[PDB]
Structure formats: C-alpha cells, structure tokens
Design a protein around this ligand. Structure first.
Ligand SMILES: Cc1ccccc1-c1ccc(S(N)(=O)=O)cc1
Ligand SMILES: [Zn+2]
Length: 257
C-alpha cells in the first residue's frame, strides 16, 4: 500500500484516501506576502518542562519519538487554539538532497527537513477520537536548514542506528524536546490535515517562522534509515514528504508583522 515511491506515493493516495483531494489538505505553500497579520492572535504557550519521552520507533514512513500523553505533561496552548493539546509524538520529513525535504514551503522555498510536534485536544479524551474532529490536533511545524549542528537533536541522531528498519523501536527516555525549538515562537497558522494517510482534516497547523539549523552530518544520518523491514531489500528512507496542496478556500494568518 501507500508510501513515497513512484507507484505508491502522494499522487496515488487519493485512490485509497479520497479526502486527499479535500478542501483543507496539508501541507501548503506559505505565501508570506499574502498571509495576513492577525493582532488578535495570542502568543503560543509551549509547556514542555514535564515532558516524558518513552520510545523511538521506525514506522516505515518516518521515525516517531513518543511521549507519555496519559497526563497533561507536555502541552501546547494559546496561539489560535482554544483549550489544551497534549504532545503525543514528534517526527520529521526530509529529503535526499539538502534543497528539498520540507512539506510546507515558504514563498515556494523548500527546506532540508521539517519537524512535526503532534498534539491532540484533551477535550476528546484520546488521540484516536481527536483525529475524527476538525479541531482535534495541533501540529507545530518547524523548518530545518543545513548549517550549524543543533545540539538538542544529537541524541535523536545517535539512536537511529538501532532503529534502522521498519518496525524497530528503542527505549528513548528523558529526551527534552525544548532543545529542538528555535528562539522565536512567531508563527503562521491555518486549518489543514494530516500530511500522510489517512489524511484526516483534523489539524490546526502552527508553523514557526524561524527555522532551526542542523548540520549536514545530522541530516546525513536521517538519510541512512530504511523504509523496508529487516531482511528486505534496502530502500533508503529519503523524500518522505508530501508536496504542497491547493490552498482552496483558506487564509493563512501570521502572528507577527
Ligand atoms: C500515521 C497516522 C495514523 C493514524 C492517525 C494519524 C497519523 C498521523 C499522520 C500524519 C501526521 S503529520 N505528518 O500531519 O504530523 C500525524 C499523524
Ligand atoms: Zn509529519
């Protein structure tokens, strides 16, 4: 079934997931000149001090760093959001080359990678319920450019050898996701979807203006991961990104002038 290759990639997804051609699909191009500053947008509130990471998993499409979301430990609120969203996992999308890899683009510019911190609205009780709601998820998206290393990313990079193939997981406790954030929390926001199947239209996207810098060696190690399972022919996990989708009847709002 679905993946990122010629025969099962983004152009094919609509056959099993017709919502692929829906009215609020993600990612999108962020046209910075058309985005409107909204002075009524509140600052983001990122509360990750009590975050409890548990595990890192190669799921055959990316790797997820998973958190304990059974309590309000790591939460996102404020910004465009009403209520409290719990961090459940983060993952990345990245390219085979430094000039591609992000899902969102900025004035059509592609970054080397994009970090997604996935949160669900606690008023819906669990993640599975939340993805069935138009305001069920808040995903914080952060662009990665290649330059200096991101020290807070290195513990992720160093465990990737142990989860090379699909279905492999490793203990990944005591990781602090605060080390993945840029200085500024200025953001764009719009209503959208999951960027992989099932492509559900349940996401409030919050995309940070300021990218983080990662080193060429760090992203190189992302690209050594495998889509395949152990004992199967090696296919490098690269270019696991969906391209920009039609904006249709949506406005992107900016928290900043
Ligand atoms: C992969 C998956 C399975 C069931 C429910 C949600 C997901 C999912 C898909 C995409 C994202 S993204 N890349 O928009 O942050 C997050 C979760
Ligand atoms: Zn993602």
């Amino acid at each position: 079934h679905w993946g990122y290759g010629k025969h099962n990639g983004p152009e094919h997804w609509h056959k099993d997931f017709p919502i692929a051609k829906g009215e609020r699909q993600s990612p999108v191009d962020i046209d910075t000149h058309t985005a409107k500053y909204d002075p009524s947008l509140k600052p983001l509130s990122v509360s990750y001090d009590q975050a409890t990471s548990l595990r890192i998993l190669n799921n055959g499409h990316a790797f997820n760093v998973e958190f304990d979301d059974s309590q309000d430990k790591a939460v996102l609120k404020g910004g465009p959001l009403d209520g409290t969203y719990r961090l459940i996992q983060f993952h990345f999308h990245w390219g085979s080359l430094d000039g591609q890899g992000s899902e969102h683009t900025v004035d059509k510019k592609k970054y080397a990678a994009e970090l997604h911190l996935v949160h669900w609205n606690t008023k819906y009780g669990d993640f599975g319920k939340a993805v069935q709601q138009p305001d069920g998820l808040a995903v914080l998206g952060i662009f990665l450019k290649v330059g200096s290393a991101k020290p807070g990313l290195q513990k992720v990079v160093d465990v990737l050898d142990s989860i090379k193939t699909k279905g492999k997981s490793a203990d990944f406790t005591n990781f602090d996701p605060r080390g993945l954030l840029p200085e500024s929390l200025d953001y764009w926001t719009y209503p959208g979807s999951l960027t992989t199947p099932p492509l559900l239209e349940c996401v409030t996207w919050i995309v940070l203006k300021e990218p983080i810098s990662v080193s060429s060696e760090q992203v190189l190690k992302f690209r050594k991961l495998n889509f395949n399972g152990e004992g199967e022919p090696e296919e490098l996990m690269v270019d696991n990104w969906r391209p920009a989708q039609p904006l249709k009847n949506r406005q992107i709002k900016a928290s900043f002038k």
